[PDB]
Write a protein that binds this ligand. Structure first.
Ligand SMILES: Cc1cc2nc3c(=O)[nH]c(=O)nc-3n(C[C@H](O)[C@H](O)[C@H](O)COP(=O)(O)O)c2cc1C
Ligand SMILES: Cc1cc2nc3c(=O)[nH]c(=O)nc-3n(C[C@H](O)[C@H](O)[C@H](O)COP(=O)(O)O)c2cc1C
Lengths: 350, 350
């Protein structure tokens, strides 16, 4: 059997009518599916444990995930090898702690709420991969390191130092966070993982057989930033927000890396350095998107590849053939590298 | 008034004798201090809320922090402007959920435990600064960005690519994590903050008037790594673990930086780039510790400074005078840069 524990937030205030309507329908449908567990609600927060056959649990959770009556749904625990139920006589008992006034309940209710609020804070500072791993039924702390082929993605804001020199601190942070949000949304949708931000740089990766998705993600980012630039208000710093992007491919180490008290689930390897070094060359090469021949050859779609140069850095003493893709979007984005050389006056005036 | 909520783990199994001994003494001392609240215990976990006058709360918490009967003590919430108690008739009521069997308690007990276990996982992936901010009574999500003078620290492992080429993946990760742990312990003790790991690199910062502590932290790291190298088993990769370090000083932006779902409380600015670029020069300059004249002049202690070079990168088109400190430890660590040029055979044989 499978047992799923999640928490969620009310999308909007819910009356007593609606709360017991949820319990009513949930209990009837879980009875049919031989699913048991408990649904708790407290100050506009839901907690639910559900247990039963994995296929039935997944289909129920799928409906729960689509229910517009709550949001911020976060699976805290997925157990996929359960052989004894924890709540057998209870298709879906519902408990409302708001209407509860019992003696020892008052301190436990406060603790539940404070734990949940603290957990919601830490979620905002936690890599998305950690919650994905948890939702697959794995404790991330017990993942052992492995060598894995990845496509590594590195991007940054062109002429970012001009933004920091010219704009108030709150506007600098607004620009960087807008950029990070654009990149993160598209990378994640294309099946990649944003693993680190450093300064105004994004580091991300894709499965090693997903060069096509990494390339498409990169082109979509350039496309989204074009929409952002040309839709921004007159005088907005967003009108001169341009990105450089570099991709590389290689065997890296994936796992928990860090100090005793603080680690990241992330990657380590030469392809990280290569992606960052390629991304740095975007200005010299006058191309917003650059990538290695290994990425080029790994792709299976008929992209309009253009050879740029044979270049070296390192280290390992081997030259690297560097490519881009030639289309209207990359030409426009590459012209943006030139525009961004002289945005100081424009930014001085926001 | 102040109200403090924390969680902790039993250091070792505790009997019923010891649990109520804690409640007994806690209630008597809190009665004296006019402190109220509740202490809960569940499967070897403590939860406590304490409220009263700030000075009395801090002294009680100080004793609690030193009590060897629990560990992993983590403050989840500090409220410093409380004007109404939450548990007035209760100097220190103790509730034991293990011995509890009530009806609606069983699901809430399970939820408490699952929330706590999940919270303990996220703690391991959370920057230390976030818990410090929380313990000072501030929600980190509501900190606005500010310009601040910092000393920025950047360090990495010399010839790290050789480690990755020669060692099994689990040993590579063991080495990097050992290094990260050494740096993080010393930086934190010296009043700095480790804010980011990237590859085998540590990025950290200190208050802008703390160049002396940043320099001392750097020298202590070199000292600790010497002890690590010369105490490691025969053939251990740790015997050839060397670091480079660079320090810079400048006005940076500090705040919440990232995407909508994932941010870091960290810094952004030119001094981050300068520290990393200086750290990269350690090999060319044959010096394990390098820093800018701005760091040198900001220090007030009579360090044995040595001028190394007048160098440029960027960007901003200004040359930077680069210094180190000349003592036995830096000379030994700098000779290690040379040794690390040719550790491939040594590492091939572990
Ligand atoms: C907090 C919450 C918990 C829910 N729990 C369950 C559940 O345990 N089982 C279930 O079948 N539906 C549950 N639902 C409702 C589903 O989202 C959905 O409304 C219903 O199952 C779909 O019924 P349908 O087959 O007509 O589409 C829950 C909804 C909410 C808001
Ligand atoms: C889980 C736990 C909770 C505690 N809570 C309190 C408390 O609320 N108030 C208190 O005075 N001591 C509390 N203590 C005990 C203190 O750590 C310490 O033993 C005692 O207060 C010191 O007494 P002293 O003045 O003789 O040094 C707690 C201990 C543990 C393990």
């Amino acid at each position: 059997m499978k047992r799923l524990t999640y928490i969620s937030k009310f999308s909007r205030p819910l009356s007593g009518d609606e709360i017991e309507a949820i319990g009513r329908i949930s209990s009837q449908k879980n009875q049919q599916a031989n699913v048991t567990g408990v649904l708790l609600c407290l100050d506009g927060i839901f907690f639910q444990i559900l247990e039963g056959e994995a296929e039935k649990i997944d289909r129920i959770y799928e409906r729960i995930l689509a229910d517009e009556r709550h949001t911020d749904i976060l699976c805290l625990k997925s157990e996929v090898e359960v052989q004894e139920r924890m709540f057998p006589d209870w298709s879906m008992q519902t408990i409302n702690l708001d209407e509860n006034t019992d003696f020892l309940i008052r301190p436990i209710k406060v603790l539940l709420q404070t734990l949940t609020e603290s957990h919601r804070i830490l979620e905002k500072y936690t890599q998305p991969s950690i919650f994905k791993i948890i939702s697959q039924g794995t404790n991330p702390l017990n993942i052992r390191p492995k060598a894995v082929e990845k496509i590594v993605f590195f991007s940054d804001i062109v002429s970012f130092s001009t933004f920091a020199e010219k704009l108030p601190v709150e506007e600098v942070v607004s620009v960087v966070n807008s950029y990070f949000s654009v990149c993160t949304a598209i990378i994640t949708r294309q099946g990649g993982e944003v693993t680190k931000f450093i300064g105004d740089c994004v580091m991300a990766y894709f499965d090693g057989d997903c060069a096509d998705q990494a390339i498409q993600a990169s082109l979509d980012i350039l496309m989204e930033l074009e929409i952002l630039r040309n839709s921004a208000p007159e005088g907005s710093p967003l009108r001169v927000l341009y990105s450089g992007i570099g991709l590389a491919k290689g065997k890296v180490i994936e796992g928990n890396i860090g100090s005793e008290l603080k680690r990241d689930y992330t990657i380590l390897g030469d392809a990280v350095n290569v992606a960052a070094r390629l991304e740095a060359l975007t200005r010299q090469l006058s191309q917003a998107l650059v990538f290695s021949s290994e990425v080029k050859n790994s792709a299976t779609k008929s992209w309009n590849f253009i050879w740029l140069t044979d270049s070296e850095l390192k280290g390992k003493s081997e030259s690297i053939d560097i490519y881009s893709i030639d289309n209207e979007m990359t030409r426009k984005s590459s012209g943006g590298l030139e525009i961004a050389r002289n945005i100081g006056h424009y930014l001085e005036r926001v």
